[PDB]
Design a protein around this nucleic acid. Structure first.
Ligand SMILES: [K+]
Ligand SMILES: [K+]
Ligand SMILES: [K+]
Ligand SMILES: [K+]
Ligand SMILES: [K+]
Ligand SMILES: [K+]
Ligand SMILES: [K+]
Ligand SMILES: [K+]
Ligand SMILES: [K+]
Ligand SMILES: [K+]
Ligand SMILES: [K+]
Ligand SMILES: [K+]
Ligand SMILES: [K+]
Ligand SMILES: [K+]
Ligand SMILES: [K+]
Ligand SMILES: [K+]
Ligand SMILES: [K+]
Ligand SMILES: [K+]
Ligand SMILES: [K+]
Ligand SMILES: [K+]
Ligand SMILES: [K+]
Ligand SMILES: [K+]
Ligand SMILES: [Mg+2]
Ligand SMILES: [Mg+2]
Ligand SMILES: [Mg+2]
Ligand SMILES: [Mg+2]
Ligand SMILES: [Mg+2]
Ligand SMILES: [Mg+2]
Ligand SMILES: [Mg+2]
Ligand SMILES: [Mg+2]
Ligand SMILES: [Mg+2]
Ligand SMILES: [Mg+2]
Ligand SMILES: [Mg+2]
Ligand SMILES: [Mg+2]
Ligand SMILES: [Mg+2]
Ligand SMILES: [Mg+2]
Ligand SMILES: [Mg+2]
Ligand SMILES: [Mg+2]
Ligand SMILES: [Mg+2]
Ligand SMILES: [Mg+2]
Ligand SMILES: [Mg+2]
Ligand SMILES: [Mg+2]
Ligand SMILES: [Mg+2]
Ligand SMILES: [Mg+2]
Ligand SMILES: [Mg+2]
Ligand SMILES: [Mg+2]
Ligand SMILES: [Mg+2]
Ligand SMILES: [Mg+2]
Ligand SMILES: [Mg+2]
Ligand SMILES: [Mg+2]
Ligand SMILES: [Zn+2]
Lengths: 134, 57, 74, 48
RNA sequence: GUGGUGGCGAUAGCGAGAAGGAUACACCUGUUCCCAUGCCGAACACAGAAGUUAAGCUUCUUAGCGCCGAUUGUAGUGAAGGGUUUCCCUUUGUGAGAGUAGGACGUCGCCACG
RNA sequence: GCGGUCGCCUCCUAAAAGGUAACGGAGGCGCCCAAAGGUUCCCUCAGAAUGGUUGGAAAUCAUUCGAAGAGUGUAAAGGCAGAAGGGAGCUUGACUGCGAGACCUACAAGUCGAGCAGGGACGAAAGUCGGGCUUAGUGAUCCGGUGGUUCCGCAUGGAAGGGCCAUCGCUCAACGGAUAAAAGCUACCCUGGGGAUAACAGGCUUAUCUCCCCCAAGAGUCCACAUCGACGGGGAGGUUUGGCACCUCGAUGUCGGCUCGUCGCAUCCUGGGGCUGUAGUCGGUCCCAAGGGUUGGGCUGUUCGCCCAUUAAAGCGGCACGCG
RNA sequence: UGAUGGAGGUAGAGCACUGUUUGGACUAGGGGCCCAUCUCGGGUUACCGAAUUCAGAUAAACUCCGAAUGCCAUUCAUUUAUAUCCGGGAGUCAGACUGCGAGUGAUAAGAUCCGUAGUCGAAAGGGAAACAGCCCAGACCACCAGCUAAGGUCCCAAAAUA
């Protein structure tokens, strides 16, 4: 996952404080994975979690990725001193704040869903918990 | 009516506005006491430095 | 390459509401008409709002979503 | 090509005004009715 | 009642529907006249009063949209403190946005004809 | 050092006044316009649908829908549909002498300005006009050129030459401009300073690096976990490649070797043990264990590495990459 | 310090604009298959699918909104005692750390660069074992007097084996 276009190549790291503004409830799926901490999440982590969840589900049911890695983070190569401008964009992240429902799943029985979400959570860096649609 | 304000906490390390408020009330050394009218302005000053003083009637 | 920036133009209000000012005092510096010239107030060549006469400054709203400066002599 | 120029008063030959014109757009000498402070009245000023 | 003309944040609006022209206002009849169209008397200008409320306009119904919007709670936050201190928590004061109860199909003047 | 930058304008950083840095993130300027200025009058956009010769997605035309989603010379922000956008007529206020008072400000400068007078443009009048929707489009002084001038004129009259006013000559762009005029080598070097500032070692940090793990898609005939384990996740260590510049520049000697060792254990051998895809002999993996031992040469300054020949084994690291 | 009035778009939040973005509905349209080819019209992939719409996110350089604070001001109020202006004499232009808000960095550094408050600098004393910058607190002096702050009370070691 990578945005097709960006208004600005380089972006602030930002700060993550408090609960997520929105997306704290399950919208489409029957079950969801809620972040209990705040952390950056990379497109790689999102993709790894998504693949794990789908593989276990056996292409049964539907999977929604609520988060998207809009933000870009840069880096400086080894052996490069401080200064001389910002680094080149290295990767893409989604700042996820606690309470966000990162993934949703439907069309699968409850026990399969719980195991699938468990695998996805182990791939992600944040501590998580399973949430049922209300 | 009246307020007896006594400075129970040192002003060292405090914001300039709080130091100025204590001075405006007219308190000097620690445990220095003063008597003032219970006006809205005076009670406002006391509230500004409420953590540094004790107020009696 | 970045690293350029123009000098700040010290825009904004130069007189407070309810303040007495002399004729010709600058009330508000701006780009475009963020606030409009009201009574006894002129707008300079570069959108600066100034008092045409002595009086007290008053910022009001011009209708629903626009502002206005007036100078009222006493 | 835009160039600075001087408008001289025809009546008194006084170089009262400075301005600029685009030569290509205005090949001919510019002429304006401008106030001549020396004569204190409007006169024809021609570029020189 | 209508026509001019203003004040007030659209609570004056928009949408939909209904009624009226007695006067008034309009459409409306014309281009000889002043005047006019980068062509057109469509418009602007002028002259004039056969017809019509059809439209505009006026009055009225409507909460569909737009607009206004209390209280409660919450986010943030000044001040004073704490913790396991990229953050989080407590006391105190302040307190949104959102979402709602609701409000509202205007009101305050002056003139002229009735 | 190389590269980049140097003045000016706009935005974000900037923490709801103003201001506010970084070799922070984005862009622009060194002009253009005789109308793209002034004024009087007049007008309202972009797109979409429907219909329509050439004509096509899209040329021009018509109706409706359309509040700005257009335009505003030129970057961006702010602003403008009572227009600052668009069109027409007339014009030259893109005026002269100023200017109460303000903003900005170390100075020099910079910005705004009602209003007074002179003489005008437009308009019936009100009234507007000292350029352009606003904010860049610029350069001190010295020196010199051109024009004007009721100023001065070394005994006097002239003159020569100055003054004053107006204006021209700057990529003085290192843009408050050293001079009218200027590039290099030094390991033959020297002096005054600095740990304000680099190279060695120390310190902080741990991205990287080494090691240890979590999840388990898989490989393993079957069988995730004997063994290996993708996509991902989390740590420890302070031996690597690095970052910072805190001690040392009135001196902390730098590789390798030799002599002497000592310590850590993430154990190379030996000892104990579990699991095994352990028949036995061999092993693999993991657990405990630092008592002792852990090589002699060829090549290269070498460390490292390759090779020869051995050994139970030929461990990995720290100690100023121990030890001048 | 209070009361009152203001200017401003941050925190937060929001999607009304602009970017980024998820899923669903529908679909212009585009894809190859065959019939028909003058390539003319289909009928197709739950083929790819703009626009619209529904639902859901996201933003330093987005805003329909919008604080707390701070700021400007008042012939205002209470308390306080400084503010200007003129002149003589300076020194300073290496700052450090801590807390809070940002950037750079890797949301590393006792890193770097700003904003804001404090301390050190130029501050002795008590606490943090020792420990400029943290916590409490500002030494004119004498005392073999007393009350407290931070921090403490079993022994070193003053005070609860409360
Ligand atoms: K996790
Ligand atoms: K007519
Ligand atoms: K009608
Ligand atoms: K209404
Ligand atoms: K014109
Ligand atoms: K220079
Ligand atoms: K040499
Ligand atoms: K060393
Ligand atoms: K580490
Ligand atoms: K471990
Ligand atoms: K098995
Ligand atoms: K040295
Ligand atoms: K074994
Ligand atoms: K051993
Ligand atoms: K050798
Ligand atoms: K050798
Ligand atoms: K050793
Ligand atoms: K030696
Ligand atoms: K939006
Ligand atoms: K913002
Ligand atoms: K002085
Ligand atoms: K600080
Ligand atoms: Mg600026
Ligand atoms: Mg101008
Ligand atoms: Mg509300
Ligand atoms: Mg500001
Ligand atoms: Mg501020
Ligand atoms: Mg224009
Ligand atoms: Mg003579
Ligand atoms: Mg002589
Ligand atoms: Mg310079
Ligand atoms: Mg030689
Ligand atoms: Mg020397
Ligand atoms: Mg020295
Ligand atoms: Mg140093
Ligand atoms: Mg040392
Ligand atoms: Mg430093
Ligand atoms: Mg010495
Ligand atoms: Mg061990
Ligand atoms: Mg030999
Ligand atoms: Mg050594
Ligand atoms: Mg030695
Ligand atoms: Mg925010
Ligand atoms: Mg530092
Ligand atoms: Mg010093
Ligand atoms: Mg001390
Ligand atoms: Mg000392
Ligand atoms: Mg006691
Ligand atoms: Mg004791
Ligand atoms: Mg006890
Ligand atoms: Zn003349």
């Amino acid at each position: 996952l990578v945005p097709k276009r960006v208004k600005h190549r380089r972006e602030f790291r930002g700060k993550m404080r408090g609960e997520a503004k929105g997306g704290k409830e399950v919208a489409f799926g029957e079950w969801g994975l809620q972040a209990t901490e705040s952390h950056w999440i990379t497109n790689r982590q999102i993709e790894a979690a998504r693949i794990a969840m789908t593989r276990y589900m056996k292409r049964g049911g539907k999977v929604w990725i609520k988060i998207f890695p809009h933000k870009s983070y840069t880096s400086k190569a080894i052996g490069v001193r401080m200064g001389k401008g910002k680094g080149a964009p290295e990767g893409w992240v989604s700042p996820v704040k606690r309470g966000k429902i990162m993934f949703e799943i439907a069309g699968v029985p409850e026990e399969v869903a719980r195991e699938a979400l468990r695998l996805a959570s182990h791939k992600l860096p944040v501590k998580t918990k399973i949430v049922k649609r209300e | 009516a009246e307020l007896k304000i006594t400075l129970k906490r040192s002003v060292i390390g405090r914001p300039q506005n709080q130091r100025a408020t204590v001075k405006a009330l007219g308190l000097g050394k620690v445990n220095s006491t003063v008597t003032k009218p219970a006006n809205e302005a005076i009670k406002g000053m006391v509230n500004t430095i409420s953590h540094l003083v004790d107020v009696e009637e | 390459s970045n690293g350029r920036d123009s000098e700040s133009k010290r825009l904004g209000a130069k007189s407070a509401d309810g303040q007495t000012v002399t004729g010709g005092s600058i009330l508000y510096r701006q780009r475009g008409t963020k606030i409009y010239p009201g009574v006894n107030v002129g707008i300079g060549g570069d959108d600066t709002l100034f008092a045409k006469v002595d009086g007290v400054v008053r910022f009001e709203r011009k209708g629903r979503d626009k502002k206005q400066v007036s100078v009222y002599p006493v | 090509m835009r160039v600075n120029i001087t408008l001289e008063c025809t009546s008194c030959k006084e170089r009262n005004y400075l301005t600029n014109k685009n030569k290509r757009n205005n090949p001919d000498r510019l002429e304006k009715q401008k106030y001549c402070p020396r004569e204190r009245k409007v006169t024809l000023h021609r570029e020189t």
